[PDB]
Design a protein around this ligand. Structure first.
Ligand SMILES: CCCCCCCCCCCCCCCCCC(=O)OC[C@H](COP(=O)([O-])OCC(O)COP(=O)([O-])OC[C@@H](COC(=O)CCCCCCCCCCCCCCCCC)OC(=O)CCCCCCCCCCCCCCCCC)OC(=O)CCCCCCCCCCCCCCCCC
Ligand SMILES: CCCCCCCCCCCCCCCCCC(=O)OC[C@H](COP(=O)([O-])OCC(O)COP(=O)([O-])OC[C@@H](COC(=O)CCCCCCCCCCCCCCCCC)OC(=O)CCCCCCCCCCCCCCCCC)OC(=O)CCCCCCCCCCCCCCCCC
Ligand SMILES: CCCCCCCCCCCCCCCCCC(=O)OC[C@H](COP(=O)([O-])OCC[N+](C)(C)C)OC(=O)CCCCCCCCCCCCCCCCC
Ligand SMILES: CCCCCCCCCCCCCCCCCC(=O)OC[C@H](COP(=O)([O-])OCC[N+](C)(C)C)OC(=O)CCCCCCCCCCCCCCCCC
Ligand SMILES: CCCCCCCCCCCCCCCCCC(=O)OC[C@H](COP(=O)([O-])OCC[N+](C)(C)C)OC(=O)CCCCCCCCCCCCCCCCC
Ligand SMILES: CCCCCCCCCCCCCCCCCC(=O)OC[C@H](COP(=O)([O-])OCC[N+](C)(C)C)OC(=O)CCCCCCCCCCCCCCCCC
Ligand SMILES: CCCCCCCCCCCCCCCCCC(=O)OC[C@H](COP(=O)([O-])OCC[N+](C)(C)C)OC(=O)CCCCCCCCCCCCCCCCC
Ligand SMILES: COC1=C(OC)C(=O)C(C/C=C(\C)CC/C=C(\C)CC/C=C(\C)CC/C=C(/C)CC/C=C(/C)CC/C=C(\C)CC/C=C(\C)CCC=C(C)C)=C(C)C1=O
Ligand SMILES: CCCCCCCCCCCCCCCCCC(=O)OC[C@H](COP(=O)(O)OCCN)OC(=O)CCCCCCCCCCCCCCCCC
Ligand SMILES: Nc1ncnc2c1ncn2[C@@H]1O[C@H](COP(=O)(O)OP(=O)(O)OP(=O)(O)O)[C@@H](O)[C@H]1O
Ligand code: CUA
Lengths: 51, 125, 62, 98, 251, 130, 222, 104, 49, 52, 50, 110, 78
């Protein structure tokens, strides 16, 4: 807290599941990649369900 | 003077006075030799200045550092042979008379042979 | 000609106001800038006294 | 798609793993054609959010100092107006001389 | 060892400095460039002075927060302390930062409030780490500018440590005997906490880090008002000295 | 990879500047930069009144009981009065300065009043939605 | 027509607009319909962003402290220390509010490309310190005589090995620099030059760069 | 990285001439490419060539700290194979060489 | 158990979070343009992290 | 040794002649000989011819 | 590509040393002049060095 | 594949390490840079900027463009020489730079 | 960067300090800093308007400014 400018970057809660912060460009890129990683499993998941 | 000026002057004088305080410390087991005299020191400096004066025009005219480096290396090889001679003669010198004789020989050898060699190599370049 | 670009060189002020004096001064071919663009980003070599003397003795081209 | 492109489908099945899962592999397409839509749309929303965040970062980095300088100049101009009024008052006071 | 010889002839290095395109840097009084130098030894049986340490570093020691037994009031004395210290007290107060960002005089017992909050503070099931910084408190947070590259040279005194900032996702292994260089670029204004991520021993758990990336104007203000004065405090330390330095070096 | 993200929001444009006199301020700053005056206070449009001594003596600070030990031309740039060249090249930039000051004065004169009813939902008019 | 001296500064011209009419400049600028809202937002943002200091009712002055976490600021506002008077962003009251970039680089004598593959830079630090010590063995005793360390600082010349020193300091950590400084002290005390000990050039393999005519080896072209 | 083309093959004959002029490990090739870019569309004009040379001066000044008059007092403007961009003079010389190699 | 819940739970949760909680935005902030963006949910809590 | 006289900077005509000469050399370079574009390309090619 | 291979191009250098059991941050003297010589962005994306 | 990669790694990093092991009188820096260029300019950690749009969005692309230009501004950088240029517009859509090479500063892309 | 909202403080002591600084600056600028010592703080001048709108409005008011000038002259004489 630098005056009224809140410089705190992490506001994670006790049961946080994601990254501590998403302000960093590196963390934003990692989060986007991780989210889109699971999008490309539709056919595999459906095939395994049928099996 | 201001505080900053006084601090700067004190720092300069203290930096200059390192040898003053270093003199008091000496080692017993030490092959102490006779230092070269001030007159001979000045004569050798004058000979070096004469060599630099002879060399100045050609080196200044030269525009590539390689040629200047070659000239410096050759002159340094000659002067280093003569320096080794002077060091071995003076270190064994047993009196200031011998030290002065060695220094005079070294400076005369410079003024004649080194001058001739510098002229020759500069003309070659 | 199509690929020609300025690449950020001599990107001085470009006046937009109609009555700005710069819009005529830059048009004037015989206009001398205070300093050349390449030198505008180089360290000064003259002493403060020398720079002040040069600026005082400086005369506008008109 | 897959075995149909081959004119020896028995060889296609044998040479990969010598196993037959074609029924499930070809019944999975119907489900997979629609299982992805919620994820795709939420990903579109998230990508738009990321784009907005990047645009805001660029705008801040480029203009925040400019806005601060503009506000500073505005306040300086207010002071300049007050100073002009004060100078007028001082001139009037000097001329009158109470 | 071997004694310093009476005379040495030393070649002047050429081309080291390219300023103004001048190969020769030494010129004799008569106006001639010098290619060689004569160095003479006097008083051979003499000690040699040690190299003067001309390295100046502004050093900040970041250690874990230390509990305060008593909250001392802010006391300021008179200036012109020509002696060891001035016994007279100019001002004494008990400021506290209110919600209005004003340092108002406190009407409570600061020590009592500190003890009460230490003993029986109220917490919750979902409490943000920002309001729960139990094991993440230090002193002298490292302040950097934002939107610019910085070269971080990482090293250790004794054993291998890990400078870890999860908020930035930066992990640097500090290994003894190495001078690993890393590029550090924070693209936003923010305050980040961190811990050590390498077993080190007794206080591996309790060794936090605080890094604040601020806009360059705020960073420069912090530099001029806290760090730059310390860089000359080793020799010169006074309010007038700090004012002189900040006026002399104005950005 | 190729389309791993599966979508790009090209619609989201670069947020447009909406400050009152930003263009005038930038024009004046460019003109001052062309003038190339070493002093930085000139960046403020009302410098000749905020720092009157800049035109006569250049002493903007009272160096009382504080040493004054300049080392080069970059030490006390704000202590050097403007020379004839700087004065000429700043006079060449008066038209932009006048417009900037006029815009600032107009903004100052404009004041909030009860007549405005969209003040609360002014973000849409400011184009904060994308 | 122009008076042929357009743009010339009138003699004695004073940069004052005390009695100027600003109505003639109205048409030269455009203000959006939300100018008042923008003004208020600018004021609010500047006040809440640039104000890192707080007024004190005791000293009647503005005081500030080093950056602190939200927990410290909130739950320990009553327990604060090291408060220092606010000196201002700039001495003259100007604005430091600018976007900064990267300054032009410094010319290098010992390139980092010699060992740029390694991220440790220990070899580069050693090489740079070796070159700096080679220069110091020549220029060390004249530093207090005809260089920056002279008493008469007016006629002072920069130490020739300054760039090598700074490059070595950058490449070396403080501990490694201290080790190398101890080695340098020992070597200077012994008065040992690498030239009088080096004989590995005899065993080094030949290369085109070893040609007897180094000056003529290079070929120059426009 | 700072040139005008994604890869050196996109550049015309000027990039090949720069590669020939400088050794493969010498990073002055990039400065020569910058000179090529500056000279594109300007070499064939008497004023364009001078403008390209001034652009080279500005580029060197922005890349490295430099003083006023160094580039004017450079003794030799020629470049050899083992010349590296370690100084403003070397950067300026490489940029000038690139401008010369530029054809259109 | 296998497909629909796994492929729709996180998206439903994020949609409801944006609806009823402003994606966890901390209010009292000024000038949304300059202010940073509080992203919607992006880490799949249903998937094994 | 001694230094030769450094010619003045080439004019545009000299630059064009140099470009044409470089183009001619590049075209003369055989297709089946794989030598990279570098300051030492011609020296390497001569060395290769002697080695052959 | 963004978070590596940029040591040569940095505004200034900070030395981080780890000890049992605290941290030490050192700013070299050259950092003072490096910060003093920071370019300023003014006008329509113009850069000035004071 | 692993063996070819290891052979290339050897050729770039292991064998050249032994070429120079002592101070060199002539062209020491030139020879050191010759042996270091092959190792420090490998395409694995250089190639990719030509397809930066795969991970960089338009605004992110502009910010990373300015960041990369600042990072690789140093002239003495064979890696920068071998890296793809940052002076280009995002293929999908550009929001900041309308034309390439039309700047107000030869280094800053804006 | 997230900046939290806070209206002008209007603190009595703070506004008094800012008004004193503004008065000193006005006195010095009227004579063009032709004084033995200078006590101007343009940063505090900006903060005066940023923090104390009421006094800024009073100063803008022609009658308020006249009264302030008269009081200042009376105090200086006495
Ligand atoms: C724990 C539980 C949960 C899970 C947790 C997570 C687990 C993670 C685990 C991760 C493990 C990683 C590895 C995963 C892989 C595992 C694979 C494994 O082990 O098994 C090996 C398994 C073995 O193979 P397989 O899958 O069994 O092979 C079967 C084929 O896949 C199947 O195809 P097929 O060819 O054999 O048979 C189908 C074919 C057979 O059918 C035919 O006979 C073909 C007929 C074609 C003509 C159709 C139209 C005819 C119209 C006639 C006229 C109509 C009337 C008139 C109407 C007019 C107006 C309407 O018919 C079709 O469907 C073809 C249609 C063509 C589609 C495109 C058409 C577009 C145009 C529209 C045309 C039709 C509609 C319009 C109609 C008219 C409109 C006017 O897969 C592999 O071989 C290896 C897979 C490796 C991945 C890459 C594979 C790429 C190669 C292609 C195969 C892709 C599909 C299979 C992928 C596998 C998953 C589904
Ligand atoms: C007497 C004989 C004795 C025996 C002789 C035996 C030996 C010789 C045999 C025959 C001759 C072979 C000669 C080989 C080359 C010689 C050296 C040479 O030319 O000088 C160097 C010279 C250096 O390249 P350059 O000219 O400077 O180009 C780079 C510049 O950036 C300019 O780039 P650009 O933008 O212009 O395009 C370049 C792109 C050209 O495009 C392609 O390569 C396309 C590949 C797809 C297949 C293309 C097929 C042909 C085109 C399509 C079909 C025709 C058109 C359509 C027809 C339709 C008709 C209906 O190629 C690349 O270089 C891209 C890959 C390079 C970076 C990645 C390196 C691998 C590390 C792992 C990747 C992770 C890091 C990167 C992450 C990036 C993220 C953004 O050439 C190379 O060696 C380039 C690389 C060649 C391939 C190897 C590296 C990549 C391999 C990837 C796949 C394999 C796995 C990798 C290992 C690890 C996997 C986990
Ligand atoms: C000789 C080697 C090949 C040439 C070099 C290729 C290098 C460059 C491309 C490599 C990365 C490819 C993947 C990109 C990202 C998408 C991943 C994906 O969808 O995988 C999940 C899919 C399967 O997961 P899925 O079933 O969830 O797929 C998505 C399903 N919907 C649409 C319903 C959401 O991967 C596959 O099994 C299919 C192969 C990948 C997709 C290919 C699409 C056609 C493009 C042309 C391919 C041929 C090569 C040329 C590429 C074009 C450029 C030259
Ligand atoms: C995710 C969306 C899909 C993206 C497109 C990805 C596919 C791109 C095309 C790849 C072609 C090259 C494949 C190389 C491997 C061949 C191996 C082999 O055995 O082949 C010999 C086979 C020989 O088959 P055969 O049956 O004639 O003979 C073999 C049998 N004996 C030994 C008895 C003679 O030739 C083919 O049939 C070639 C088929 C090529 C297509 C790929 C087949 C695999 C299934 C996927 C179908 C994809 C269709 C794409 C259509 C175009 C879309 C752009
Ligand atoms: C062969 C074995 C393979 C096993 C693979 C591994 C499987 C792992 C996953 C197992 C999932 C099991 C079902 C969990 C259902 C959780 C529903 C829920 O809370 O909503 C989550 C999600 C969470 O979204 P949300 O909006 O509620 O909250 C998001 C979180 N916040 C708000 C904090 C951001 O909500 C929904 O999906 C809403 C619609 C639910 C509709 C279905 C309700 C089913 C209720 C339970 C079953 C019925 C009762 C009787 C069952 C009798 C069984 C014999
Ligand atoms: C242990 C037994 C060892 C026995 C041999 C030891 C004696 C020395 C042998 C030297 C052989 C040199 C052959 C050079 C061939 C060049 C061919 C060519 O044209 O290339 C052009 C290329 C590129 O140059 P270019 O293409 O620019 O040159 C033009 C070439 N012509 C004229 C043909 C057009 O040359 C090179 O890249 C340089 C040589 C590379 C050599 C790579 C060696 C890899 C080694 C892998 C690791 C092995 C570890 C072994 C450990 C053993 C432990 C016990
Ligand atoms: C029989 C068909 C033959 C086809 C011809 C190609 C294969 C020839 C035989 C195998 C060797 C292939 C070597 C290719 C690369 C040579 C140059 C090199 O290493 O540097 C470039 C690059 C390295 O580039 P670099 O980073 O050094 O860049 C040099 C230029 N500067 C410094 C300016 C950046 O090599 C690699 O990156 C190697 C990565 C490992 C994987 C390589 C796979 C090659 C392609 C698949 C081959 C499969 C063969 C199968 C044979 C058996 C079955 C038929
Ligand atoms: C697309 O959809 C999908 C996903 O998206 C959600 C996935 O994530 C995934 C990934 C998931 C996986 C790989 C599987 C993950 C794991 C899963 C689902 C299993 C989790 C199970 C649990 C959390 C429950 C644990 C089980 C228990 C029995 C715990 C104990 C509970 C109960 C009620 C019993 C309590 C009893 C006791 C403690 C013991 C008391 C009794 C005694 C001691 C006995 C005494 C003896 C006598 C005689 C009296 C998949 C596959 C998917 O398809
Ligand atoms: C318990 C499980 C039961 C089974 C599952 C049933 C569904 C349950 C709910 C799933 C989750 C829904 C909510 C979360 C995902 C959607 C989020 C969303 O819509 O985000 C907005 C986004 C576009 O908005 P954007 O512009 O990015 O942001 C600014 C908004 N003004 O939105 C978009 O991307 C735009 C969407 C436009 C409308 C799409 C309509 C789809 C209709 C499908 C018809 C049938 C299938 C057709 C398939 C064709 C292709 C094969
Ligand atoms: N003191 C130095 N400062 C900066 N760069 C240097 C220095 N010495 C050498 N270099 C770099 O090494 C290259 C080769 O140096 P060398 O001693 O051969 O040059 P030179 O003969 O003085 O002439 P040139 O500058 O034309 O190469 C120089 O081009 C420059 O790139
Ligand atoms: Cu220090 Cu773990």
């Amino acid at each position: 807290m630098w005056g009224n400018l809140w410089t705190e970057a992490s506001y994670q809660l006790n049961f946080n599941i994601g990254f501590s912060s998403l302000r960093s460009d590196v963390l934003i890129h990692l989060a986007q990649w991780q989210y889109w990683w699971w999008f490309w499993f539709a056919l595999i998941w459906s095939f395994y369900y049928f099996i | 003077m201001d505080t900053i000026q006084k601090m700067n002057y004190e720092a300069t004088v203290n930096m200059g006075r390192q040898d003053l305080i270093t003199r008091e410390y000496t080692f017993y087991s030490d092959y102490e030799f006779i230092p070269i005299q001030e007159d001979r020191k000045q004569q050798m400096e004058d000979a070096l200045n004469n060599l630099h004066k002879i060399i100045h025009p050609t080196v200044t005219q030269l525009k590539k550092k390689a040629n200047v480096q070659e000239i410096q290396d050759r002159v340094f090889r000659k002067l280093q042979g003569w320096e080794g001679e002077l060091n071995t003669c003076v270190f064994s010198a047993k009196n200031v008379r011998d030290s002065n004789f060695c220094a005079d020989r070294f400076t005369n050898r410079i003024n004649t042979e080194g001058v001739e060699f510098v002229k020759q190599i500069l003309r070659e370049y | 000609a199509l690929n020609k670009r300025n690449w950020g060189y001599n990107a001085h002020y470009k006046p937009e106001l109609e009555r700005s004096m710069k819009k005529v001064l830059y048009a004037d071919p015989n206009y001398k800038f205070p300093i050349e663009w390449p030198e505008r980003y180089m360290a000064e070599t003259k002493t403060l006294e020398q720079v002040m003397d040069e600026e005082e003795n400086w005369e506008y081209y008109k | 798609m897959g075995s149909v492109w081959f004119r020896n489908r028995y060889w296609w099945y044998r040479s990969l793993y010598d196993d037959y899962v074609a029924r499930e592999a070809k019944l999975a397409f119907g489900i997979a054609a629609f299982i992805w839509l919620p994820h795709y749309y939420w990903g579109i929303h998230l990508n738009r959010a990321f784009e907005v965040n990047f645009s805001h970062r660029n705008y801040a980095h480029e203009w925040g100092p400019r806005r601060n300088r503009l506000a500073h100049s505005l306040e300086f101009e207010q002071f300049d107006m007050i100073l002009e009024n004060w100078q007028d008052l001082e001139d009037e006071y000097a001329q009158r001389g109470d | 060892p071997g004694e310093v010889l009476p005379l040495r002839i030393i070649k002047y290095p050429l081309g080291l400095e390219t300023i103004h395109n001048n190969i020769f840097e030494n010129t004799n009084n008569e106006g001639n460039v010098e290619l060689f130098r004569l160095r003479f030894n006097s008083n051979s049986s003499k000690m040699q002075h040690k190299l003067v340490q001309d390295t100046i570093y502004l050093t900040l020691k970041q250690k874990r927060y230390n509990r305060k037994k008593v909250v001392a009031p802010q006391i300021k004395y008179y200036k012109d302390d020509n002696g060891n210290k001035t016994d007279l007290v100019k001002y004494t107060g008990k400021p506290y930062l209110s919600n209005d960002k004003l340092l108002k005089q406190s009407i409570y017992d600061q020590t009592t409030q500190y003890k009460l909050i230490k003993k029986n503070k109220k917490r919750g099931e979902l409490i943000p780490v920002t309001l729960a910084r139990r094991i993440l408190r230090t002193k002298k947070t490292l302040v950097l500018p934002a939107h610019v590259n910085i070269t971080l040279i990482t090293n250790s005194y004794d054993i291998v440590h890990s400078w870890f900032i999860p908020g930035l996702g930066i992990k640097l292994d500090c290994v003894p005997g190495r001078s690993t260089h890393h590029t550090f670029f924070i693209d936003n204004v923010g305050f980040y906490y961190g811990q050590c991520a390498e077993i080190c021993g007794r206080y591996h758990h309790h060794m936090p880090i605080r890094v604040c990336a601020l806009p360059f104007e705020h960073f420069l203000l912090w530099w001029n008002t806290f760090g730059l004065p310390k860089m000359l405090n080793t020799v010169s330390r006074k309010r007038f000295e700090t004012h002189y330095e900040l006026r002399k070096y104005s950005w | 990879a190729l389309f791993f993200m599966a979508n790009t929001a090209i619609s989201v444009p670069s947020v447009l500047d909406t400050s009152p006199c930003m263009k005038q301020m930038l024009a004046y700053e460019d003109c001052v930069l062309d003038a190339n005056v070493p002093q930085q206070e000139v960046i403020h449009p009302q410098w000749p009144t905020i720092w009157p001594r800049l035109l006569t003596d250049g002493k903007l600070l009272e160096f009382d009981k504080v040493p004054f030990h300049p080392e080069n031309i970059y030490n006390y740039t704000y202590m050097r009065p403007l020379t004839k060249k700087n004065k000429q090249y700043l006079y060449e930039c008066e038209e932009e300065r006048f417009v900037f000051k006029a815009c600032l004065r107009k903004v100052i004169s404009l004041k909030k009043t009860d007549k405005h009813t969209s003040w609360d939902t002014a973000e849409v008019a400011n184009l904060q939605l994308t | 027509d122009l008076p042929a001296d357009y743009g010339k500064m009138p003699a004695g011209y004073n940069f004052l607009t005390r009695g100027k009419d600003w109505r003639e400049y109205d048409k030269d600028f455009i203000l959006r319909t939300d100018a008042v809202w923008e003004k208020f937002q600018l004021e609010h943002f500047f006040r809440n962003y640039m104000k890192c200091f707080f007024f004190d009712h005791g000293l009647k002055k503005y005081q500030m402290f080093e950056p602190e976490d939200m927990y410290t600021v909130v739950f320990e506002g009553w327990a604060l220390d090291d408060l220092i008077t606010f000196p201002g962003f700039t001495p003259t009251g100007r604005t430091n509010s600018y976007q900064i970039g990267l300054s032009p680089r410094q010319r290098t004598v010992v390139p980092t490309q010699t060992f740029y593959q390694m991220q440790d830079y220990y070899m580069l630090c050693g090489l740079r310190f070796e070159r700096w010590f080679r220069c110091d063995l020549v220029y060390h005793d004249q530093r207090h005589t005809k260089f920056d360390q002279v008493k008469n600082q007016k006629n002072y010349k920069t130490y020739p090995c300054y760039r090598e020193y700074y490059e070595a300091q950058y490449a070396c950590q403080d501990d490694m620099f201290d080790f190398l400084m101890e080695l340098a002290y020992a070597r200077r005390a012994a008065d040992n030059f690498e030239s009088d000990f080096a004989s590995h050039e005899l065993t080094t393999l030949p290369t085109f760069y070893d040609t007897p005519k180094a000056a003529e080896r290079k070929t120059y072209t426009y | 990285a700072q040139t005008a083309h994604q890869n050196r093959y996109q550049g015309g004959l000027c990039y090949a001439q720069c590669n020939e002029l400088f050794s493969f490990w010498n990073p002055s090739i990039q400065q020569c490419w910058k000179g090529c870019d500056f000279g594109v569309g300007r070499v064939n004009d008497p004023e364009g060539r001078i403008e390209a040379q001034q652009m080279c001066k500005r580029w060197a000044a922005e890349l490295y700290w430099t003083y006023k008059g160094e580039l004017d007092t450079i003794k030799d403007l020629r470049v050899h194979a083992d010349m590296y961009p370690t100084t403003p003079q070397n950067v300026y010389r490489a940029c000038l060489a690139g401008v010369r190699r530029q054809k259109f | 158990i296998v497909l629909t819940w796994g492929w729709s739970s996180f998206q439903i949760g994020g949609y409801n979070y944006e609806r009823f909680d402003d994606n966890g935005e901390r209010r009292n902030t000024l000038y949304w343009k300059l202010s940073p963006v509080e992203f919607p949910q992006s880490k799949l809590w249903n998937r094994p992290s | 040794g001694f230094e030769t006289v450094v010619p003045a900077p080439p004019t545009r005509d000299d630059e064009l002649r140099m470009i044409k000469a470089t183009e001619e050399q590049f075209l003369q370079q055989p297709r089946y000989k794989l030598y990279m574009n570098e300051a030492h390309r011609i020296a390497k090619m001569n060395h290769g011819d002697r080695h052959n | 590509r963004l978070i590596e291979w940029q040591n040569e191009s940095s505004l200034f250098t900070v030395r981080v040393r780890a000890r049992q059991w605290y941290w030490i941050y050192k700013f070299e003297l050259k950092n003072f002049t490096d910060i003093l010589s920071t370019p300023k962005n003014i006008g329509n994306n113009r850069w000035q060095i004071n | 594949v692993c063996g070819i990669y290891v052979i290339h790694v050897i050729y770039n990093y292991m064998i050249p390490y032994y070429w120079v092991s002592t101070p060199l009188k002539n062209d020491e820096f030139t020879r050191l840079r010759m042996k270091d260029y092959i190792a420090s300019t490998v395409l694995e950690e250089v190639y990719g900027i030509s397809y930066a749009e795969w991970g960089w969005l338009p605004h992110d692309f502009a910010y990373n463009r300015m960041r990369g230009l600042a990072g690789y501004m140093h002239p003495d950088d064979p890696r920068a020489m071998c890296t793809s240029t940052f002076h280009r517009k995002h293929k999908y859509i550009e929001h900041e730079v309308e034309k390439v090479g039309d700047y107000h500063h030869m280094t800053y892309p804006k | 960067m997230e900046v939290k909202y806070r209206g002008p403080s209007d603190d009595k002591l703070e506004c008094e300090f800012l008004e004193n600084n503004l008065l000193s600056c006005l006195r010095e600028k009227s004579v063009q800093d032709n004084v033995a010592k200078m006590t101007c703080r343009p940063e505090f001048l900006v903060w005066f308007f940023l923090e104390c709108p009421t006094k800024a409005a009073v100063y803008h008011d022609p009658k308020g400014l006249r009264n302030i000038f008269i009081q200042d002259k009376i105090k200086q004489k006495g």
